């Protein structure tokens, strides 16, 4: 039938030449940024005076790829409940029914910036301890739900002036590069992957926080990896045997063999505990590399460690449609049901 819900509950405003339609409680929408999949405004929840981030999905029903990604993102954001993992305060559409459903919005905690904006500056070790501790807590959590990031980089780590950290954009890897944060087994596919793909990235980010320099930077990854392995050395026959390719085998065999790792030449100014953690995270062998839960027990983190904060997901993340192909309309119908049944 006919209804006044929409006109009473929502207002329209142009922000960054894009039409936004928001519930009346969210005021003063201000452009923050844009990507391929959405755009973000900050707004004030007038009920409390608090700042939130609102993401308008960008034409999510233009293709199956976009619609499926929007679905999986919504599901992930709804499932995760951890302080170091970005989550949902609200989702809504202006539409009163499925018939009229074309647009939706995600409401999230506002974070002023991200680590990419700070890279190049040398961080004090206590700042590294606190920020990397938060990264690992967040990873422990998503990993416990069966979710991996797989594309962790400074741009994906939201931070504020108090060094609070949230992880963004996890679980969407299956849905141009000169600085390389992905695990070598992911970039070069030379070995089976596990959840410690994200621990390698933490290592690269921590290395960069320490020195001010990107660890792997240049046109060709393998050439940049070599520069480091020439200084650091590689693991032995137990590692080489796991390699899925004899050309990868020859590459590793041609590098210096070093029984015990020592990142002293690599990071001369790094404290002993920093260097030791770096060595255990920046580990080529995927079975030897620390998990998040293991890295959290490292003495590097003692000044900030609170085991109670190191939670796990109560339930595994469930996405039966992960490998499915549906039409745009079928993805839309699945998304709509998830918006309607949302509750904070």
Curated annotation (Swiss-Prot):
Domain of life: Eukaryota
Regulation: Activated by phosphorylation on threonine and tyrosine by dual specificity kinases, MAP2K3/MKK3, MAP2K6/MKK6, MAP2K4/MKK4 and MAP2K7/MKK7. Activation by ultraviolet radiation, hyperosmotic shock, anisomycin or by TNF-alpha is mediated by MAP2K3/MKK3. Inhibited by dual specificity phosphatase DUSP1.
Record Pfam families: Pkinase (PF00069)
GO annotation, biological process: cellular response to anisomycin; cellular response to hydrogen peroxide; cellular response to interleukin-1; cellular response to sodium arsenite; cellular response to sorbitol; cellular response to UV; intracellular signal transduction; positive regulation of inflammatory response
Residues that coordinate or bind ATP: 32-40, 55
GO MF, one example: MAP kinase activity
Phosphoserine: residues bearing it: 48, 343
Catalytic activity: L-seryl-[protein] + ATP = O-phospho-L-seryl-[protein] + ADP + H(+); L-threonyl-[protein] + ATP = O-phospho-L-threonyl-[protein] + ADP + H(+)
Domain Protein kinase: 26-301
Keywords: ATP-binding, Cell cycle, Kinase, Nucleotide-binding, Phosphoprotein, Serine/threonine-protein kinase, Stress response, Transcription, Transcription regulation, Transferase
CDD domains: STKc_p38delta
List of catalytic residues: 151 (proton acceptor)
Keyword Chloroplast found: no
EC number: 2.7.11.24
Disulphides: none
SUPFAM superfamilies: Protein kinase-like (PK-like)
Entry cofactors: Mg(2+)
A Gene Ontology term for the protein's cellular component: nucleus
Tissues in which the UniProt entry reports expression: Expressed in testes, pancreas, small intestine, lung and kidney. Abundant in macrophages, also present in neutrophils, CD4+ T-cells, and endothelial cells.
Post-translational modification note: Dephosphorylated by dual specificity phosphatase DUSP1.
Described function: Serine/threonine kinase which acts as an essential component of the MAP kinase signal transduction pathway. MAPK13 is one of the four p38 MAPKs which play an important role in the cascades of cellular responses evoked by extracellular stimuli such as pro-inflammatory cytokines or physical stress leading to direct activation of transcription factors such as ELK1 and ATF2. Accordingly, p38 MAPKs phosphorylate a broad range of proteins and it has been estimated that they may have approximately 200 to 300 substrates each. MAPK13 is one of the less studied p38 MAPK isoforms.
Family of this protein: Belongs to the protein kinase superfamily. CMGC Ser/Thr protein kinase family. MAP kinase subfamily.
Summary of subunit composition and partner proteins: Interacts with MAPK8IP2.
Domain notes: The TXY motif contains the threonine and tyrosine residues whose phosphorylation activates the MAP kinases.
Annotated protein name in UniProt: Mitogen-activated protein kinase 13
Taxonomic source organism: Homo sapiens (Human)
Gene that encodes the chain: MAPK13
